[PDB]
Amino acid sequence: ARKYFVAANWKCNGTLESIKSLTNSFNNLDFDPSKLDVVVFPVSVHYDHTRKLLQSKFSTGIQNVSKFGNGSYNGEVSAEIAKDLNIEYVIIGHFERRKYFHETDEDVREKLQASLKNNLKAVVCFGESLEQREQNKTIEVITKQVKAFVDLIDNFDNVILVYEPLWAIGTGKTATPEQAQLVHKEIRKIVKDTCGEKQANQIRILYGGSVNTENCSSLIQQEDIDGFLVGNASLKESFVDIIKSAM
Amino acid sequence: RKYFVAANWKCNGTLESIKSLTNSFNNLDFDPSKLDVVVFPVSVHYDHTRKLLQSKFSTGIQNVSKFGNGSYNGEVSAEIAKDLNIEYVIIGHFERRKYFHETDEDVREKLQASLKNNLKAVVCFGESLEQREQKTIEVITKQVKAFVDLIDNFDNVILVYEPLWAATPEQAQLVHKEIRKIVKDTCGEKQANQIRILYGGSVNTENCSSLIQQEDIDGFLVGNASLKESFVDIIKSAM
Ligand code: NA
Ligand code: NA
């Protein structure tokens, strides 16, 4: 059975003090990290503080990684740098980077390649827009985005996929858990076709639409949904109840 | 004008290399009341670098978000930098304009955000080879006027001229003079004379004295030469 995977994406939020409070509440949840992965993704400049405060049962990672290695790339964090810090996970392809920062599929492929070359584990995100879904292009769009990188995966525990239903983010639409399950099953079929059946059965595919303490169980109880990359709910002490849905 | 010498480490460093390097930099006895010396490590190295450098060194980050806190995956807000006591940000560096499509509107937003949050800003601009062959003053003016009306305290914003077209010290000096005229015309005589205007082209131990001696160059935003222990001689040239 796939190991469930529950991730907190803090995005651009936090102070030193709010992290101290939050991490203290997180550390009070007794869970076994051999039975589920729980990963926290603070802002880059908060990584050291966050890593120090969380107990070792929590994994940690950063929200983006450079497509370039070391050198004259002002502002970027190379995968080589993250490896030297033992940063375990990186998020790649998050829709906010594609939206505000013009990140492309080619960018996602190059960042994944840098990450795996440096022994980082990658959480790689994709998903279609409302206009794409209304034109019945969900499968075409998702296949193209997944095929941009999936053939690079060399270890199916170390890359984690995230379906972001952009048509249901800020649009007034709500994805049901059944709608999400169908998209997850299709993502898994893409992986089987490029990488193999054992590989597709092993890879975690997370839901990355809106997740909170109310809907989390209806989502993770779906057969092909293996956890979540969680947004603002993960800034609340109640995020522990989301982690409990995977325990 | 207090001189200003800055180490831009760009995307370089390991925990061990930064230990060695900061240990050499800490051996230079300079007076931070006389001279500003700023180190700008990679974001994930900020904490380690700040803990290692003596407080005479100021520190900063190489970029800041144009957005506030909230749902902007991968970004670092000015509000976050303020809370961490990050003292400086670099804004508008040519590598961001080049690889990351950063625009003049982005520079102004980022400055406004940084100043709202009491950060000091090292703002970078400069013309390309094509613009030089044809537009130097038109282009640099468009660039400074993107953000200059936002400067409220002329000690806290540092301008940096990057000769993307490349430069002699004499050619650098001319642009610096032009830049200071832009500030004088926009913000006033006394404001123009207070603002530091640094050289952002290639600086090393062999050219640093020729550059700093120029009337309108007030220090440097230094690249690869700042990853070496000899950066201390660069700092010395400004002492
Ligand atoms: Na499931
Ligand atoms: Na001078």
Domain harbouring B125, CATH code:
3.20.20.70
Q: Half-sphere exposure of A246 toward its Cβ, with a 13 Å CA cutoff?
A: 31
First to last CA, chain A: 14
| Residue A29: φ, ψ to 5° | -85, 125
> In terms of CA atoms, which chain B residue is nearest residue A80?
B14
Kindly state the DSSP code that residue B144 receives in the 8-state scheme.
H
CA–CA dist A208, B12 (Å, integer):
32
Smallest Cβ distance to A84: which of B10, B15, B46?
B15
Residue B76, chain A, CB below 8 Å: the answer is yes
Q: What is the resolution of this structure in A?
A: 1.8
Question: How close A196 comes to chain B (CA, Å)?
Answer: 32
CA–CA dist B140, B183 (Å, integer):
11
| Method of determination used here | X-ray
Burial annotation A3-12 (CB, 10 A radius, 16+ → b, else e)? ebbbbbbbbb
Q: Which two tokens stand for residue B190?
A: 């006394």
In whole angstroms, how far apart are CA A211 and each of A12, B151, B227? 18, 42, 44
For residue A40, give its domain range.
Answer: 1-247
Residue A71, chain B, CB below 8 Å: the answer is yes
Q: Which of B45, B102, B162, B176 is catalytic?
A: B162
Q: In angstroms, what is the span from residue A48 Cα to ligand 2's centroid? A: 39
Total residue count of chain B as it appears in this document: 239
Q: Which two tokens stand for residue A154?
A: 């060399």
Q: Half-sphere exposure of A123 toward its Cβ, with a 13 Å CA cutoff?
A: 34
Report yes or no: A132 and A141 within 8 Å, Cβ to Cβ.
yes
Count up the domains in chain A and report the number. 1
| Residue B208: φ, ψ to 5° | -55, -45
Backbone φ/ψ region at B188: left (φ over 0), alpha (ψ -120 to 50), beta? left
Neighbours of A52 (CB within 10 A): 9
> B27 among the known binding-site residues?
no
Place of tokens 């240990």: B23
- 3-class SS of residue B139: helix
CA–CA dist A226, A230 (Å, integer):
13
CA B149 to chain centre: 19
Nearest to B110 by CA among B153, B150, B70, B169: B150
DSSP character string of B35-80: EEEEEE--GGGHHHHHHHS-TTSEEEES---SS-SBS-TT---HHH
Q: Which two tokens stand for residue A162?
A: 């995230």
B162 is catalytic: yes
Backbone φ/ψ region at B157: left (φ over 0), alpha (ψ -120 to 50), beta? beta
> B224 among the known binding-site residues?
yes
B189 is catalytic: no
Angle between helices B136-145 and B104-116 (to 10 degrees): 40
Report yes or no: B84 and B55 within 8 Å, Cβ to Cβ.
no
B138 Cβ neighbours under 8 A, 6+ residues apart = none
Which helix (H) or strand (E) covers residue B121, if one does? strand B120-125
Closest-lying ligand to the alpha carbon of A246? Answer: 1
